[PDB]
């Protein structure tokens, strides 16, 4: 018979951090619920989709310890409307009661004993990264993860150790057209770390928290079957993508010798403009690169054509090369410098785009025929 009194703002913030992982609709109803578990002066909110689990805890003077699960999006929507600076009494009479002033809800609930929990796993690797560092690594790679059902092993980030002249922790993501690679000096404790594929959904939820968090330390724990991230009062645990990541080093063209420099904002805006005539049947933009000059052309036989021209730094043999315009804009948006540098070869070889402000990041983009 649980009975707790919580601060509306603290509870709304904590519920906001966990309710995002549940799917709104589920054939197993309790998977749409948040577990509220109050004991020993603290309440833990838990949500899961069976593959990804999140817990957040916060201290509370508990009147009666106990646990219950309630539909998470409905509870969130209720608490959203309760006044900033109110108290909420959540209780179970031996339905969950929610009382805030004269407002009283009785919500259909399901018991903790029906909520699928896991044992505290056994992890063979444990190390720490700063939150800002982990955010940087994920920010470099998240956009390139595959969403295609037929390339399941690309639907995550390959998180692995690289034995270079410096020992590195590396993250790689690709969808078969774009690839992103980012490195850092390996933290202590990654000896023996298995290379694992972190699922796309786990990356996305972890990103949402990292953006809502200033600087702190993240404890990363992993095994050959699970990875766990602990930061502040939150714990994220995820299964891995059970697959073999491809031999990605073979696609990274460190030999390209045709250097193209453009103003990044001008290039991005020009690509955006000429791609306006494209639809979903094809997003190609043709780049005609000559000394000191870049011309862009998009042709859509159902609507017309679009052309633009930019100043550029380019002193190599002229080249006509095509790219997916959205993918060009994606990679341009990863960068922060005034200039954007492409290292190119011929019209069907992948392009290499480095980050002038971060030597440890690189992007690869396959061309398309034009």
């Amino acid at each position: 018979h649980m009975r707790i009194t919580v601060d509306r703002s603290q509870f709304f913030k904590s519920l906001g951090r966990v309710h995002r992982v549940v799917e709104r609709r589920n054939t197993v109803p309790i998977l749409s619920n948040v577990l509220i578990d109050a004991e020993n002066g603290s309440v833990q909110l838990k949500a899961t989709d069976l593959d990804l689990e999140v817990t957040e805890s916060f201290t509370v003077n508990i009147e009666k310890a106990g646990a219950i699960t309630v539909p998470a999006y409905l509870l969130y929507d209720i608490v959203r409307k309760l006044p900033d600076g109110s108290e909420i009494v959540l209780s179970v009479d031996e339905a969950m009661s929610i009382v805030s002033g004269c407002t009283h809800f009785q919500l259909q609930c399901l018991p903790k004993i029906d909520f699928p929990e896991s044992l505290p796993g056994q992890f063979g690797c444990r190390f720490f990264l700063s939150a800002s560092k982990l955010k940087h690594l994920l920010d470099c790679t998240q956009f390139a993860i595959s969403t295609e059902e037929t390339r399941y092993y690309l639907n995550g980030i390959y998180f692995h150790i690289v034995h270079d002249d410096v020992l590195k922790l590396r993250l790689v993501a690709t969808d078969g057209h774009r690839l992103a690679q980012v490195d850092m000096e390996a933290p202590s404790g990654v000896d023996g770390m298995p290379g694992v594929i972190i699922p796309r959904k786990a990356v996305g939820e972890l990103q949402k928290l990292l953006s809502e968090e200033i600087d702190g330390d993240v404890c990363i724990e992993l095994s050959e079957t699970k990875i766990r991230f602990s930061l502040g009062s939150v714990v994220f645990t995820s299964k891995l993508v059970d697959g073999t990541f491809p031999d990605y080093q073979r696609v990274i063209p460190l030999g390209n010798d045709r250097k193209l420099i453009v103003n990044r904002q001008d290039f991005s805006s020009a690509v955006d403009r000429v791609s306006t005539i494209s639809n979903d049947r094809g997003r190609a933009v043709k780049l005609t690169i000559e000394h000191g000059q870049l011309k862009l052309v998009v042709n859509n036989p159902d609507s017309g054509s679009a052309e633009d021209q930019l100043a550029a730094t380019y002193t190599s043999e002229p080249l006509e090369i095509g790219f997916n315009s959205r993918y060009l804009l994606d990679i341009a948006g990863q960068l922060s410098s005034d200039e954007m540098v492409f290292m190119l070869s011929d019209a069907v070889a992948p392009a290499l785009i480095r980050d002038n402000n971060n030597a440890e990041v690189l992007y690869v983009l396959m061309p398309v025929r034009v």
């Binding site: 078969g176 491809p246 073979r250 992948p350 396959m366």
Partner: peptide, 10 residues
């Protein structure tokens, strides 16, 4: 629309 020369999958 060629893929990156990923082995396997391209």
């Amino acid at each position: 629309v060629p893929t990156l020369p990923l082995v396997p999958x391209g």
